[PDB]
Amino acid sequence: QAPRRPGIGTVGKPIKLLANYFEVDIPKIDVYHYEVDIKPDKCPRRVNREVVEYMVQHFKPQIFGDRKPVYDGKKNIYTVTALPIGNERVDKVSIKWLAIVSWRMLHEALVSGQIPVPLESVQALDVAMRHLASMRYTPVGRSFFSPPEGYYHPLGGGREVWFGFHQSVRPAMWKMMLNIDVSATAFYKAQPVIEFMCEVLDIRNIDEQPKPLTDSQRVRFTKEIKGLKVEVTHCGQMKRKYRVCNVTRRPASHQTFPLQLESGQTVECTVAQYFKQKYNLQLKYPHLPCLQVGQEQKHTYLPLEVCNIVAGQRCIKKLTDNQTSTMIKATARSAPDRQEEISRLMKNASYNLDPYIQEFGIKVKDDMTEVTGRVLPAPILQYGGRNRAIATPNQGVWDMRGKQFYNGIEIKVWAIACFAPQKQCREEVLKNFTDQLRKISKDAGMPIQGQPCFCKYAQGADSVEPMFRHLKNTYSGLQLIIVILPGKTPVYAEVKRVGDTLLGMATQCVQVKNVVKTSPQTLSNLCLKINVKLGGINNILVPHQRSAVFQQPVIFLGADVTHPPAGDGKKPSITAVVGSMDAHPSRYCATVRVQRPRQEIIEDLSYMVRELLIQFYKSTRFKPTRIIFYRDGVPEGQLPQILHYELLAIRDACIKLEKDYQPGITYIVVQKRHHTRLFCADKNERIGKSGNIPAGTTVDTNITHPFEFDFYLCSHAGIQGTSRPSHYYVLWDDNRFTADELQILTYQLCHTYVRCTRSVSIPAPAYYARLVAFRARYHLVDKRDPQALAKAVQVHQDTLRTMYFA
RNA sequence: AAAAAAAAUU
């Protein structure tokens, strides 16, 4: 149980909106919940649905009547009236009654408040409404897809775009709502394994050179196919499927396995020879490796040429850079375009004609729910210099033109390390970028004075550490190294490992293409990062517009955790907590840890908060009387456990610091990872080419929680596609914020982000936490272990208190 | 890595 919504907000200008939420009308009835268990039970959900379907259609007069039950594909089945089964395990499948779920109770929860929304009742409603979809389409998380028909969008690397939709049912202010959004995700093309391989290795003619793969080629191919299912072609249309657990180092020609004889003895056989003796198949590519499938001890190896990628597998592995861009061009669409697609999808699903939805007397509205939101007023920013200019945000954006940093750092001692080849970045071009940067930096109050003390060309990652060591040895007062990089490169991680964690030196990296073509905007943005890295302040919130929380010392924290990529289970999850270090709030310090893979709870949270509080005290000489904690979204089903642990840890950090130190805690989870979309009802209110809602629009009624304290705030200007409004859930509040105070404060924090003169989509602290976690992933790049991983992530004392993550 | 937004048996 979270705190109750204290009231609704009154600040700002009302704006009429439409939300991809569709009203659901449920009957006030009892539904009946049965358990099904099937043997074997390691089987995919699509199989179980087949079994249950076969069962329903066949055993009508015996044990089903003419009812239309609904099934989740696993263990749960629901019916609108009781089955003539009583209380009996009927029989490879059995059914036995479990419980009654009350939709009457769910209705009352929504208009009363006094009990938590009953999740078993919501679950039964969801299963019922997605039952037909689950048979017609391929289910993926809470979404549905079908194979490309009438379109084709390959991504490269054996991947392609499938279009589909997200569907979920959620309790809202007075009613259950159906949330529908259009969606698109990457799937693997169903094609032979050899063609998959050629795509991922960029081989244009596999018959050109019949020689084994290089080690790099095999490694690259391996990371790509590991975990996928494949099916075999050499058996008479049997087409047995397997999962890939590895790719052999040896060609099929050289790969051996113990061949078991009828007697039970074993002889050594090669894969190539086996396929000849057994299937009378002489391999075309005995130089290519095999797929190891099944257990890593059952020695089962498949030559590539007898294998196809199984149709219909989603790509969980991360997309590359092109891949991602390619996908966005095919999938993104303006707010109005998306708005039409949702509505068309909605009109074309005909939910009220779904005979399952009818069986349960459920009704859904055809039209997007209308909602009134409010556009919050944007805070003004205070700049420095002799004019002390103000910036007034306009549609979520302002600029540095005519403005000096609130506190600008003078830069007299700085170096250039150019890791791009000299021919691609010659001294004259380098001097040109340098001259430009200096003019711009001087205009911003952060003058880079004179010539660099050191400017040298190098190549490769291995050269970073010796050069940086020399630099630290020779210029112990070096303020900055500008590192020039040739595109994406392993030296970046090396520069950050060496500068952030080994030696404690500030570095600002810049792509050579940006050095070669100096745009004013780009150089100006570089100054923003450089100034704070060197301990400057770019701007502050004009102080009089702040929350009453600033009457006393207050600290703002942001927290995030990043998990290792799919496949990786070895690599750790990373936890990051940042905290404000002044009263503006502008400057932040960071803490970071490594922990058990996949754990969402921030395990060292108490330790981490304690460090931040101690550092806050060192810097301001006050103890905060309040702690405002912004937590990145977690999985809904785990957040009671998350909250219980983390709220206690934060409390513990205070308690373990000093007797009688009890600051008030506000704990807010921020979620961008959801499918709620908001559109202007009035065409004329749409902003930009993308036609999105204005930066600052806030919604805290109608589509939000029926009794708890949550709101949507779209803090940023929509540049492309359809904006995602961030969702804020208040899980704890000792500080008794009113709605306005907390919505305004959250919005203001989106204007304190140092890396751009724009309101960003989440508060600065939460955003910095993400950056910090991402930087630590670079520190771990390696090119006893648990103690070694913790050390790799610990940054040097000389940068530990700086904003190295900007 | 100037930056924000943006789609996710063998």
- DSSP letters of A190-237? --BHHHHHHHHHT-S-TTS---PPPHHHHHHHHHHHTT-EEEESSSSS
What residue has its CA nearest to the C1' of B8? A185
Q: What is the DSSP string of A160-199?
A: EEEEEEEEEEEE-SSSEEEEEEEEEEEEE---BHHHHHHH
The answer on A597 and A497 residing in a single domain is no
Give the Cα separation of A119 and A684 in Å (integer): 40
Q: Using CA atoms, how far apart are residues A349 and A369, in angstroms rounded to an integer?
A: 17
State the Cα–Cα distance between residues A596 and A603, nearest whole angstrom. 9
Q: How many CB atoms lie within 10 A of CB A417?
A: 24
**Residue A175 CB: number of other CB atoms within 10 A?**
20
Please provide the DSSP assignment of A485-538 as one string. E-SS-THHHHHHIIIIIII---EEEEEHHHHHS--HHHHHHHHHHHHHHTT-B-
CB proximity A514–strand B (7 Å threshold): yes
Judge if the beta carbon of A474 is closer than 7 A to nucleic acid strand B.
no
Give the Cα-Cα-Cα angle A472, A473, A479 (nearest 5 degrees): 30
| Neighbouring residues of A380: CB distance < 8 A, sequence distance ≥ 6 | A390, A391, A392, A393, A541, A542, A545
* A388 CB neighbour count, 10 Å cutoff: 11
Query: Any idea which residue has 């054996």 for tokens?
Result: A158
CA distance A479 to A500: 14
User: Measured between alpha carbons, how far is residue A72 from residues A33, A34, A53, A88, A782 in Å?
Assistant: 11, 11, 12, 21, 44
Instruction: Indicate yes or no: strand B within 7 A of the C-beta of A33.
Output: no
- A342 CA to B7 C1' in angstroms comes to 16
* A235/B1 CA-to-C1' distance in Å: 50
Question: Cβ within 7 Å of strand B: which of A 107-166?
Answer: 141, 166
Query: Are residue A507 and residue A653 in the same domain, yes or no?
Result: no
Secondary structure class of A484 (helix, strand, coil): strand
Q: Which residues contact A142 (CB under 8 A, 6 or more apart)?
A: A166, A167, A168
User: In Å, what is the CA distance from A75 to each residue of A35, A72, A124, A132?
Assistant: 6, 7, 13, 17
Of A89, A101, A93, A96, the closest CA to residue A127 belongs to: A101
Tokens of A75: 């263990």
**Whether residues A369 and A380 fall in one domain:** no
A320 touches strand B (CB under 7 A): no
d(CA A433, CA A414): 15
Residue A609 to residue A629: CA distance in whole angstroms: 10
Structure tokens at A698: 């806030």
Same domain, A287 and A330: no
A654 and A532 housed in the same domain? no
Q: Distance (Å) from CA A253 to C1' B5?
A: 52
B chain positions with any atom within 7 Å of a protein CB: 1-10
Query: Of A354, A374, A394, which closes a domain?
Result: A374
Of A543, A646, A544, the C-alpha closest to A603 is A646
From the C1' of B9, which residue's alpha carbon is nearest? A300
Establish whether the CB of A721 is closer than 7 Å to any nucleic acid atom in strand B: yes
Contacts of A283 (CB under 8 A, 6+ apart): A252, A272, A275, A276, A303, A305
Q: Which helix (H) or strand (E) holds A154?
A: strand A154-156
Calculate the angstrom distance between C1' of B2 and CA of A250.
Answer: 46
Round to a whole number and report the distance in Å from the CA of A457 to the C1' of B6: 37
* Residue A343 CA from chain centroid, whole number: 27
* Residue where the block lists tokens 């780009």: A522
| Among A544, A563, A581, residue at a domain's last position | A544
The rounded distance, in Å, linking the Cα atoms of A633 and A448 is 40
For A679, the domain range is: 545-806
Is any atom of nucleic acid chain B found less than 7 Å from the CB of residue A512?
no
By the 8 A CB rule, do A308 and A191 touch?
Answer: yes
Measured in angstroms, what separates residue A257's CA from nucleotide B8's C1'?
40
- CA dihedral sign of residues A587, A593, A598, A600: negative
CA of A158 to C1' of B5 (A): 28
Q: Is the CB of A648 under 7 A from strand B?
A: no
Distance CA A418, CA A467 (A): 11
Instruction: Please state, in angstroms and rounded to a whole number, the distance separating the CA atoms of residues A41 and A55.
Output: 17
Which residues are CB-contacts of A789 (< 8 A; sequence separation ≥ 6)?
A572, A594, A780
Are the beta carbons of A629 and A738 closer than 8 angstroms?
Answer: no
Same domain, A784 and A643: yes
Q: In whole angstroms, give the CA distance from residue A189 to residue A314.
A: 10
The residue among A608, A636, A550, A568 whose CA lies nearest residue A769 is A608
Residue where a domain terminates, one of A333, A358, A374: A374
HEC string for A711-745: EEEECCCCCCCCCCCEEEEEEEECCCCCHHHHHHH
A464 touches strand B (CB under 7 A): no
Alpha carbon distances (Å) from A293 to A198, A240, A274, A299: 20, 12, 16, 8
Q: How far apart are CA A514 and CA A485, in angstroms?
A: 10
Calpha distance A224→A665 (Å, rounded): 45
CA of A405 to C1' of B1 (A): 24
**Between the CA of A674 and the C1' of B8, what is the distance in angstroms?**
12
Solved with: X-ray
Q: Is A521 exposed, middle or buried (0-12, 13-18, 19+ CB in 10 A)?
A: exposed
Do A307 and A353 reside in the same domain of the chain? no
- The count of other CB atoms within 10 Å of the CB of residue A162 is 20
- CA dist., res. A562 & res. A219, Å (int): 25
User: For position A539, which CATH number holds?
Assistant: 3.40.50.2300
A300 touches strand B (CB under 7 A): yes
Among all strands, which nt has the closest C1' to A519 (CA)? Answer: B2
A18 plus A99 within the same structural domain: yes
Distance CA A420, CA A457 (A): 7
Among protein residues, the one whose C-alpha sits closest to the C1' atom of B10 is A300
In angstroms, the CA A76 to CA A391 distance is 57
Question: Is A522's CB less than 7 Å from nucleic acid strand B?
Answer: yes
Calpha distance A644→A87 (Å, rounded) = 38
Number of domain units in chain A = 4
Expressed in Å, this structure's resolution amounts to 2.3
CA A479, C1' B2: Å apart?
19
Which amino acid does the sequence have at A203? Answer: I
Residue A594 phi, psi dihedral angles, 5° rounding = -110, 145
Residues A327, A463 within the same domain: no
Q: Tabulate helix, strand, coil % of chain A (nearest 5).
A: 35, 25, 40
Tell me the CA–C1' distance in angstroms for A82 and B3.
60
| Nucleic strand B near CB of residue A266 (< 7 Å) | no
Count CB neighbours of A29 within 10 A. 14
Contact (Cβ atoms closer than 8 angstroms) between residue A45 and residue A405? no
Q: State whether A282 and A143 are in the same domain.
A: no
Strands A664-671, A626-632: pairing kind:
parallel
Is A328's CB less than 7 Å from nucleic acid strand B?
yes
Taking the C-alpha atoms of residue A394 and residue A399, their distance in angstroms, rounded to an integer, is 10
Same domain, A208 and A228: yes
- Strand B proximity: list residues 557-616 of A with CB under 7 Å: none
Closest CA to A495 of A111, A799, A150, A55: A799
- Whole-number CA gyration radius for chain A: 30
Q: What is the greatest pairwise CA distance in chain A? A: 94
| Window A754-783, strand B contacts by Cβ < 7 Å | 755-756, 758, 760-762
Closest-CA residue to A226 (of A570, A598, A594): A570
CATH of the domain at A254: 2.170.260.10
Structure tokens at A7: 């009231």
**What six digits make up the tokens of A735?**
């500080």
Going by the DSSP 8-state scheme, the letter that residue A84 receives in this structure is T
Nearest amino-acid residue to B7, taking CA and C1': A328
Question: How many residues are present in chain A?
Answer: 806
* Alpha carbons A642 and A637: distance in angstroms, whole number: 10
- Answer whether A742's CB lies under 8 Å from A630's CB: no
* Contact of A687 with A395, CB cutoff 8 Å: yes
The answer to whether A469 and A397 are in contact (CB under 8 A) is no
User: CA nearest A52: which of A86, A94, A6, A13?
Assistant: A94
Q: In angstroms, rounded to a whole number, what is the distance separating the alpha carbons of residues A590 and A611?
A: 9
Task: Give the whole-angstrom CA distance, residue A743 versus residue A117.
Answer: 25
* Tokens (6 digits) for A424: 């691609």
Instruction: Report the CATH number at residue A770.
Output: 3.30.420.10
Closest CA to B2 C1' — which residue? Answer: A522
Is the shortest CB-to-strand distance from A245 to strand B under 7 Å?
no
What own/partner pairs with CB < 8 Å and gap ≥ 24 does A206-215 have?
A206/A285, A210/A285, A210/A287, A211/A287, A212/A251, A212/A287, A212/A288, A212/A289, A213/A288, A213/A289
CA dihedral (A649, A651, A654, A657) positive or negative = negative
Nucleotide B3 C1' to residue A399 CA (A): 13
Same-domain status, A514 and A565: no
Alpha helix segments (H runs only) across A350-463: 355-359, 427-443
Is any atom of nucleic acid chain B found less than 7 Å from the CB of residue A234?
yes
The gap from C-alpha A304 to its chain's centroid, in whole angstroms, comes to 34
Tell which residue, A481, A485, A426, A439, has the closest CA to residue A461: A485
Q: How many CB atoms lie within 10 A of CB A780?
A: 17
Q: Confirm if A711 and A698 have CB atoms less than 8 A apart.
A: yes
Orientation of helix A605-620 relative to helix A639-655, angle to 10°: 40
A498/A746 Cα distance (integer angstroms): 36
Strand order in the sheet with A540-541: A390-391, A381-382, A540-541
- Provide the token pair at A68: 């239309």
Q: For the sheet containing A454-457, what is the strand order?
A: A454-457, A414-418, A480-485, A507-511
Is strand B in 7 Å reach of the CB of A168? no
DSSP-assigned beta bridge partners for residue A697: A375, A714
Q: Are A456 and A492 in contact (CB under 8 A)?
A: no
